[PDB]
Write a protein that binds this ligand. Structure first.
Ligand SMILES: O=C(O)[C@]1(O)C=C[C@@H](O)[C@H](O)C1
Ligand SMILES: O=C(O)[C@]1(O)C=C[C@@H](O)[C@H](O)C1
Ligand SMILES: O=C(O)[C@]1(O)C=C[C@@H](O)[C@H](O)C1
Ligand SMILES: O=C(O)[C@]1(O)C=C[C@@H](O)[C@H](O)C1
Ligand SMILES: O=C(O)[C@]1(O)C=C[C@@H](O)[C@H](O)C1
Ligand SMILES: O=C(O)[C@]1(O)C=C[C@@H](O)[C@H](O)C1
Ligand SMILES: O=C(O)[C@]1(O)C=C[C@@H](O)[C@H](O)C1
Ligand SMILES: O=C(O)[C@]1(O)C=C[C@@H](O)[C@H](O)C1
Ligand SMILES: O=C(O)[C@]1(O)C=C[C@@H](O)[C@H](O)C1
Ligand SMILES: O=C(O)[C@]1(O)C=C[C@@H](O)[C@H](O)C1
Ligand SMILES: O=C(O)[C@]1(O)C=C[C@@H](O)[C@H](O)C1
Ligand SMILES: O=C(O)[C@]1(O)C=C[C@@H](O)[C@H](O)C1
Lengths: 164, 164, 153, 153, 164, 164, 153, 153, 153, 153, 153, 153
């Protein structure tokens, strides 16, 4: 699958991993995925945020399981995923996620509540703590704004108990 | 039911309506709903945002339907709603929302995908364009950040077609 | 001879939700009575509250109302309470629907409230309301004929 | 202005199956027209055959009938074909039920034929038939008003 | 449809009506329907029984409804029916039977409990007071032996109450 | 459980085993089970039939499984059973029946098609080749008349292939 | 020691809906207490409003009520909200039903509210209410014993 | 006045399965009677056999037992037979459950045997048994008043 | 070599129900045969009667028809009878659908009759009928080759 | 004019899984084209990977393929992704099945991918593939006629 | 070290129901122990009675049995009681199936008793029994190692 | 004598997901063979890819593997394709589960893959793998005895 990433300088620093599910490579709303990624980057460079993104799209469920598994070599501290149609079917990823080790957030462009009966459950989303759907590309940024706060708060907490 | 609101000065200006469902008046995480509201207000005064909020909680499905119906006296231009347990059952509010006239966003503290079978469907969120669940109080701000962008883009659009 | 019309949730919103208001439906009804020359006091009550329909039906049980026409709206599909209430009304209740609830989503198909009513008119738009007057008038006429047929022998 | 009434299976059996016959229901209808002074030719057709209802509706598609009132009876719950047929009728079809099919066994609850018709009258006993005439008259009146409203501008 | 009948002399006399559903006309076990009928007649002429049968097969659900409706012109006093595949689907005959006026018995060559999930319910058999299935042609005679006893007992009963 | 039997002389001879389900011991229509048994006996002594019955009622599902297993010590050559409510639940007896080795017929006084949803399936009857239900006590005799014919025809058949 | 009794929709209609009123049920309870010599202030509240049950339970959370006996009635089967409420009451809630809701239609079988309450009495007619007092008295007694057993060591 | 208490499968295991035995439950009952000054012979029977419950209920039908309290345990959810048995007992049967079967797995939610019983106590732990005595006493008392009210006129 | 084509309910209504008649479909087939130079007598039969499909299939069992192409229409989803009939035809039956019945409402998804046929063509509009001829020709050809392959050794 | 043939999981196993290989199926197609004198480049791709079907479909979206024939095999029943893919292919997709998936286990009945494709051929054994060529040829021919019919006026 | 083997209904019938008896299965087990040189007293108990399995498991709770291997047979699918029992066994219970219950009718797919056991062997024919011994030996060995690892520190 | 072990998705993650790795499981197996003195070449393959399990099984069909042990993991519940593949393996496949998939969520209860396999070991943790070797060894031994029993007469 496909993979973009930007760099980051070196003076906290939060590495985040975005995983885009099958067919998401194809948007082209009238907006494209690369565009959804600059929107994300634009919203960080902009928010004033020491966040590094890694972007990842694939059509292969195994490639999505692999990628999560990699992350567990503690690099990035959280995952933003839109499993595509795998949301509805794939227990195997739901499992990947539950032994992800870190925050995961599911994001869906459409409102899957409001579509075909079959799209209504996501197993994957049941396993991410949080789920965003319905918002169009705008949803990713919500997942980003959220991710930031989660991690932040965790850092402030790991520094909480680890003194006494 | 109960209702808070802050004021706003008079020099665009977006009035937004927050509706909290039944039992939400009870939180006291270890955070309370008034607290969830200042967090919201804090995130506006802070984001630098001409947004006026109105906060509203009730245990009464009718009172939720009433309030939406009132909004349709074009004041506020969108709604953020956590219908609580009424999400799962109440077609009547789903209906209220589908003839709401404006952007509606559903917010849930818990991740309802991940709870009892009965909590899995929300008819109301199938009628809001977008849904947020899973995020704790943080979710509300996501709905706020989103609401802003929606309206914004709408204003920019109503000014789009209305020239030619 | 006085009849109660009970309109459910969202029904008041007609004209934002064809382009016709609930007020206009009510006056249509008048026009049908005021015209059909039928001795009928109508009263309109609309609410978005399940409890307020229940209350109102419970309040009917005192003389002056001989029948209730009701569009429980969305509560039709879900409100076992309103159906329970309709059954103790002990007097004609007729359920009306603007649309054909057979013909929309799954969750609208069944009506609890409808089963409790003697009979259901649906998918006629407002005409169904006049249809309901039409029937109420008949049943009340017939009932009235019968309790004099017997309480005479 | 000529209207078709289609009665489904078993319906002819009324008086062995209250104590009233299908014939009487028909003449009631007459009495309602013959009385309501409405220019309406009615025709009655009863059958226990799914195919015969389908045939009859397909035959309506030729002028002289402007609308159909129909009680598919038991076929209501099961006949996708009749429903399909009612949908090409391209002219008002109104479904009538003597009983409230909401209020009997599970298998009667849905009506396929009902969904295809614009609207459904149920649980009124025979009155529902007059109810149906009442509606048909109105829609045909309105339709007629409209095709002259436009085909004038 | 098709229709066989034998005659009977004139010196109680029980007229019985057998109705064979769709496709039953086709057997040819390695036994045919006419054969199933002689077996029946053979078992009456044989049992020593003042019974007159009328045999009736059709493919048309309407024709089965018609025939029952006819019977209600009190000729025969009971019906033996194998609705075939219409068992499982046809409410309309179930209804015909429920306002049949007299004893009805459903017979099935096969054991419908023991076949495709769809064959498991018969609505028609739910409305007959009794149901035989599983016995092959032998089934019909069971229905005949039973029909005899039912009617008999009824005659003995109508003569029971109608004296006092 | 309980068990009746009559004797039989010694000059073909068919031994048959009747098994009555739980609660059947309680009838007392207005007829009792012993009565249902003499009706049976009466219909054999009467039909002119070299049949020996053994009657058996119990409340214990094990005791029914036991008794079938016993039969397999080839005594009687067929079983008539009314598993009572165990019809609907007990796979374990359905299995006993399927490795019964001989004709089994299920009899039910009521018409189980026409009762509570739960009584609609009988797993046992799915395993008997044939099922009678709806007939009141008269049902048993139908099972008897049938049993006779089945066995008969089998004897006639075992003498069929066993010559060439 | 003060206990709240919450009666649900339609429950007030007893005497039109055997031949006994809600008032009579309540005075029965009194008679059981007034007689049982038990230190128990009772309060009765009946409503046809889902919200008002919720509000009332939430209002209990302030001292003087130590327990709630509650017949959610129709809301029993459908009201996640009231069950959610009962769960934060943090103090005994006992559900009562006049009838045996196992023993009616499908839709009454489950109770959401019952699952949230510790225990459910059903099918006893009014006796079940005294039954409920019986139990509340016991749990409160035991709880009270225990918080003194511990807050002593 | 003699009452039969029937304990179902595994119920004898209490103390390995809070920390209380079935013996203790039974003596509690005694204490409640022995104390309530109520003329009540109790008998206890516990079994892991569906058949033995059936047999025991059928055996009750002979004089000296006027009522049955019964915790069918696991058989509650599956035993049509025991429910059929309970229904010919012709004499009060009350189901008790230690836990609130609404509040566990799907498969425990319905009780066949409970529907057959007049009423069900659940989720009270052992208290429910005394609760059951409480009720049986009342019903028997009332029944007995009534057969003398009538067999006098 | 003679083939039966069986069109089901409503299928005759094409041109009121794109803009193409059943007649045109049939002549298309001809054109495909008349052109494909294939020795094929075709016969067309359309009906709105479940029975008449059954009768027609049963009648095929006599020589001259070697195969059946059939669009049961609506009866596809419900007719166990027709499926049973197709299964004793003992000779190729091919089901055709204009539309892709996977792609409409739930109730059209399964076809009983289709499972009975050896193979189903669907969603091709009229082209599927020529598609069907295409197949029949092949199967008949192959079968014919084989009964000569064997009845030779 | 170039067409892509997509064979799904296990389909390569034909010859161990009648006694015919996937290679033979493909050369048959050739023979049908090579014979039908039709201007058609075919390409065969078989995979046991859901993703590789997806990738392959997405890769089609670049010129030279005008259509896809596809036997998703097992993924037919479960792969929402492939069905989603087929839907953006924006160019004819035809699903083929060797067997009649109506006629096996429950889980094979529905096909997600089939609903996505315009039309589905099933139960024909390998013939269905030639049947598929037959159809693709026709649609492409017709489409091509049409874009010249219009882009001329 | 003594182990209980519990065989359920019908299991004794092997050899009328491959051609192997229950006795032979048991002696096989012996042969595996007698051979594997494992210190293991086995006991065999077969029954057709749900209550007898329950009784036997309840009887295990006394010393000398350290583990149970069990084929509940048909009760697997239905007996909530036996599962309940297996849960208080407080000692290893292993479920065995001759066949693969996944691979037969719907009703056999789930096992209640299997969920209550730590682990299930199925579809191995008799070999599964030896498989079970193999496991029991291991867990007992491990448990035993552990209670000496700790009760030492 | 060489055997394939196929580990499914996530299985490699043991030690982040008791505290044991997949490597350790494999070496345990060695220890069991290396110890059991059995002539067995084992190979381990783990993948998170449905297609790779299917490929690997399809690759087995060439000599040197006589059997496959497999934990399809999450694909167990959903992969019709893998089950389809396991069925053409034409050689013993045994499914192993660390946990008791009966005893977790609904969605894990059924195994497609398991029904295709001859037999399934589950809920034993790693021991189940040695269990599997134990069985494979036996079947292969027996099969081998048999093809020499016959191909001798
Ligand atoms: O982002 C989404 O909306 C989605 O995950 C993408 C493609 C579809 O398969 C999903 O149902 C929704
Ligand atoms: O915000 C929520 O999580 C919720 O809407 C509140 C209360 C519960 O009834 C809902 O399931 C979740
Ligand atoms: O009037 C009607 O058509 C309706 O009762 C009103 C509102 C909706 O919720 C119902 O589904 C239909
Ligand atoms: O007229 C009626 O009520 C009905 O349509 C007639 C016959 C029955 O089969 C329907 O269920 C109701
Ligand atoms: O006699 C019978 O077995 C049957 O009624 C005949 C044909 C099939 O449709 C039924 O399922 C059984
Ligand atoms: O004979 C009978 O009808 C029955 O088998 C007896 C008792 C009930 O449990 C069955 O449902 C019917
Ligand atoms: O008290 C009762 O029995 C009930 O709770 C009251 C009203 C009905 O809605 C319930 O189903 C039963
Ligand atoms: O007493 C009880 O709680 C129960 O009746 C006994 C055992 C369990 O099987 C039931 O689910 C509840
Ligand atoms: O040809 C068809 O597409 C169909 O078989 C005809 C009529 C409809 O009833 C079917 O659903 C589709
Ligand atoms: O080609 C077929 O018949 C099929 O698509 C192939 C493999 C199986 O998985 C499907 O169920 C049918
Ligand atoms: O395979 C077995 O051993 C089984 O447990 C025994 C009897 C049957 O009832 C089960 O379904 C399988
Ligand atoms: O090994 C197991 O226990 C399992 O097969 C592995 C992963 C999970 O997805 C299964 O449910 C169980």
């Amino acid at each position: 699958g496909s993979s973009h990433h930007h760099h980051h300088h070196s003076s906290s620093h939060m590495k985040i991993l975005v995983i885009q599910g099958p067919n998401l490579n194809m948007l082209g709303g009238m907006v494209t995925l690369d565009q959804i990624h600059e929107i994300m980057q634009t919203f960080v460079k902009q928010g004033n945020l020491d966040v590094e993104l890694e972007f990842f799209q694939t059509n292969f469920e195994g490639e999505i399981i692999d990628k999560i598994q990699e992350s567990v070599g503690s690099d990035y501290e959280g995952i933003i995923i839109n499993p595509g149609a795998f949301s509805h079917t794939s227990i195997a990823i739901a499992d990947a996620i539950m032994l992800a080790g870190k925050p995961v957030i599911e994001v869906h462009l459409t409102n899957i509540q409001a579509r075909e009966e079959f799209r209504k459950n996501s197993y994957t989303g049941a396993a991410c703590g949080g789920v965003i759907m319905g918002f169009g590309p705008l949803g990713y940024n919500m997942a980003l704004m959220a991710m930031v706060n989660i991690l932040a708060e965790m850092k402030a907490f790991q520094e909480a108990q680890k003194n006494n």
